[PDB]
Amino acid sequence: KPYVLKFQEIRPHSEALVGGKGMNLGACSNIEGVHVPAGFCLTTEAYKRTLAENNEFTQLLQRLSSLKTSDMDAIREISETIRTLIQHTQIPSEIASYMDATLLDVGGYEMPFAVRSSATAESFAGQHDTYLNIIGKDALLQHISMCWASLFTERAIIYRIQNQFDHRKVQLAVVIQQMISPEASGILFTADPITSNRKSLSIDASFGLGEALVSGLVSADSYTVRENTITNKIIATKKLAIYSLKEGGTETRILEKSQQTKQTLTDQQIIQLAKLGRKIEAYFGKPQDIEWCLAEGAFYIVQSRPIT
């Protein structure tokens, strides 16, 4: 029914409606805290109401399942067309208004948002778009539309025919977070990722935005924690780190290099983030994949997954 939901407010099964990522985030929102970046979660019924329930589009969609994997030179143009259509389609005022509603508490288009595609299927399908540091309403009405549009790239349209997913059922729910500015960023596996064994928690940790480490453009320390003790640290030479431009976009800075070799997290912050990553582990029961960041001395959970 709803178009937007606030993370704390949402309950299971919000997955049908808010996607896997939004599901996990809301779930995270609950322990408290375990603070989670403020935001909301635009629902699949925006996709449905916006593109769901349209006519150039639906027949276009139909034209597609008259497809094959081997009609190549066509689904290219065709893809371009669906895509342009998703772009050239306005988001109704009402949905647009409900955004402003919940958004004006946290609040306003004051802060810059992260716009993350949020899949239903809790690989190469286009349900992973992340878009950073988007400022103001008009601009995220645009990216919201770009996330939806990603679903109809040739690669995503290839991957869906290959695994016989059907497009008429493709829905995309967009998660919007207000981004805070990081002292540090990182990942945390609550399980040796190679051997699958639990008792060693692994943290990665750099300066600047989290996306830059996840996307692997940047170097990062590597601490290991085993029942409340630091069993290993690896301080990396962090030459680069990425930050968000007030004007907009992101910039890649070169670190002072005195701090290039500064241990990112304090041994005490390390044990701190350890418990946190393991408090979170408790609730899901199974082992997690925790993007995080460190603002003002607070640890926020940006995402949580499960492994594999």
Residue 286 sits in a domain whose CATH number is: 3.30.470.20
Same domain, 2 and 123: yes
Same domain, 25 and 152: yes
Indicate the resolution in Å. 3.0
Give the whole-angstrom CA distance, residue 303 versus residue 260: 26
Same domain, 121 and 184: no
The domain in which residue 33 lies consists of 1-179
Give the whole-angstrom CA distance, residue 205 versus residue 84: 39
Same domain, 90 and 197: no
Of the residues 128, 147, 179, the one at which a domain ends: 179
User: 160 vs 68, 107, 238, 266, CA distance in Å?
Assistant: 11, 38, 39, 45
Give the whole-angstrom CA distance, residue 273 versus residue 307: 19
Of the residues 179, 196, 220, the one at which a domain ends: 179
Please answer whether residues 218 and 206 qualify as being in contact, where contact means their C-beta atoms are separated by less than 8 angstroms.
yes
Structural domain tally of the chain?
2
Same domain, 171 and 213: no
Same domain, 130 and 9: yes
Same domain, 29 and 122: yes
DSSP state of 74: H
Beta partners for 115? 131, 176
Residues 6+ apart with CB under 8 A from 143: 115, 131, 134
Same domain, 157 and 8: yes
State the Rg of the chain over Cα: 20
Sheet order of strands, 298-306 included = 230-232, 221-225, 201-206, 184-189, 288-295, 298-306
Give the whole-angstrom CA distance, residue 261 versus residue 235: 6
Same domain, 237 and 133: no
Domain CATH number, residue 152: 3.30.1490.20
Give the whole-angstrom CA distance, residue 62 versus residue 167: 9
Beta partners for 306? 288
Same domain, 167 and 193: no
Asked, as a colleague might, if the bond just before 88 is cis with ω within 30 of 0, I would say no
| Tokens found for residue 273 | 């983030």
Of the residues 179, 194, 211, the one at which a domain ends: 179
